């Protein structure tokens, strides 16, 4: 940014501008902070820097934050509750009250119908194909994702 | 440096003859003024006629008075203040004040000192780069960053006459390079010929 310092914002770049904006919101004190889609224009390292940012400050400062996101992993790290939206795009929509991470994730992922079993090595979501026995078994359990938690 | 006088009654004795030698006797305030400034001020006086010593050894104008017939006792309330001298002179009263009071030596204010007159800070660019602008704001000097420099928004009075200047207030003003008062021998009184003049 030292080099960016003199540069104009019109002259600037996309991803660089994004990290700067997220930081700026955090720049000032507020009871509640609101961020909308921080993942845009950012690559892997860049987003994950952001994930650490929101979680750490909020925890520390004891303030609240709402973050909108498309990225699965970013939501998981930062949040404690989730709101899922449904309906049909460009027509109508609906919002829900906040619900626990497990609860909210099942609802959202149920709309998609892709399960992300777990990869034992990576601990990564592993996608599950449609009509299946293993995937079918999960549908009866209610587990879209897995983590270092108890569960079948 | 050793114990030997450090005189008592001896320096008083020189001082005795000094009020009596000269017509005009001044009660004067060094406290504020630096000593290149005092010592220079005194250089002026010294050619004309000279200044001498005391504590309470000064207050003993009474003995001098007792020798002659002039005051006691009788004076209004003995005006002496912290940091007082006596100026014995040929020089008439009115002129002595114009030398001393008009020609004071520059100098900057001080922290915890009572301001003698109104203090203002001007608007314009300080010329200083971004940093702790906040310190200025704390005093009640508005500042904001314009053109990547710290600038003072407006002229305003930081402190009034008769109010003390805060420790933060003083330091920040010195960095600005803003000073402004006149230091010297603050005249606190005159005797001439049976008559008492206050400031």
């Amino acid at each position: 940014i030292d080099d960016i310092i003199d540069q104009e914002v019109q002259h600037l770049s996309g991803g660089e501008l994004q990290r700067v904006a997220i930081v700026l919101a955090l720049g000032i004190p507020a009871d509640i902070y609101l961020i909308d889609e921080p993942s845009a224009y950012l690559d892997s390292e860049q987003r994950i820097i952001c994930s650490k940012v929101i979680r750490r400050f909020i925890l520390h400062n004891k303030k609240t934050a709402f973050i909108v996101e498309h990225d699965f992993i970013m939501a998981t790290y930062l949040a404690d509750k989730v709101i899922v939206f449904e309906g049909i795009p460009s027509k109508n929509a609906h919002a829900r009250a906040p619900e626990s991470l497990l609860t909210g994730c099942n609802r959202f992922l149920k709309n998609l119908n892709v399960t992300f079993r777990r990869d034992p090595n990576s601990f990564r979501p592993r996608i599950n194909k449609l009509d299946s026995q293993m995937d079918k078994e999960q549908k009866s359990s209610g587990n879209y994702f897995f983590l270092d938690n108890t569960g079948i | 440096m050793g114990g030997i006088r450090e005189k008592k009654a001896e320096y008083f004795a020189k001082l005795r003859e000094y009020l009596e030698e000269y017509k005009s006797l001044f009660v004067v305030g060094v406290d504020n003024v630096s000593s290149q400034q005092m010592h220079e001020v005194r250089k002026e006086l010294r050619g004309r006629a000279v200044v001498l010593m005391g504590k309470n050894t000064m207050v003993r104008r009474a003995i001098r008075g007792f020798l002659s017939d002039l005051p006691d006792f009788e004076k209004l309330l003995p005006f002496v203040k912290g940091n007082v001298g006596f100026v014995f002179t040929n020089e008439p009263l009115t002129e002595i004040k114009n030398v001393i009071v008009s020609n004071r030596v520059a100098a900057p204010a001080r922290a915890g000192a009572v301001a003698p007159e109104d203090i203002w800070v001007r608007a314009v660019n300080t010329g200083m780069e971004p940093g702790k602008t906040s310190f200025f704001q704390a005093l009640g000097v508005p500042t904001k960053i314009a053109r990547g420099t710290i600038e003072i928004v407006s002229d305003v009075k930081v402190v009034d006459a008769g109010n003390k200047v805060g420790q933060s207030e003083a330091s920040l003003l010195n960095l600005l390079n803003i000073s402004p008062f006149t230091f010297g021998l603050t005249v606190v009184q005159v005797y001439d010929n049976g008559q008492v003049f206050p400031s």
């Binding site: 925890l59 520390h60 400062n61 004891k62 | -």
Partner: protein, 191 residues
Amino acid sequence: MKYIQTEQQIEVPEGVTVSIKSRIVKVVGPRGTLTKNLKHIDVTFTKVNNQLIKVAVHNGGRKHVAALRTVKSLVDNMITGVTKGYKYKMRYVYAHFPINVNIVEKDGAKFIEVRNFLGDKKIRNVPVRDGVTIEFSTNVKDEIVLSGNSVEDVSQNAADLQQICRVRNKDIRKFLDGIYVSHKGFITEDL
């Protein structure tokens, strides 16, 4: 060598009456009232006039006499606390981890609750003493303010808080995190 008498003055001001029997002091003024027990010492209090009270020690040693001034002072600060009152200010200090300080209550409680101290996974609590009130100063950043009639209770309540935030296992000159006492004064202003 034993000094035959040494005495002290405790000056009394317009709004207060102080009453002493055995060596039990009751000072009562505009701000409420304070009482302290001086039996552990051996001095003789004597009234001269509604605005004056003396304390004296007869035939005392160094150490006895030394305790006589400290009696004067002790009863002075009872008198001033009942007039001007006492206000200690403290400020939070941290390099990274913002120290979050609240006031909670479990069972008529009042505690000063310190979260996040250096990231610290433990939640610190210091109980508010009686006779002492706590305001988080508006207009100032991370300043807590303890006030009341008893310098001793304000001062100690203050030190309880600062000491609950000592750092361990770090260079305490680099890791200066804490809540330090920053200003000792009075409740009534101008003075």
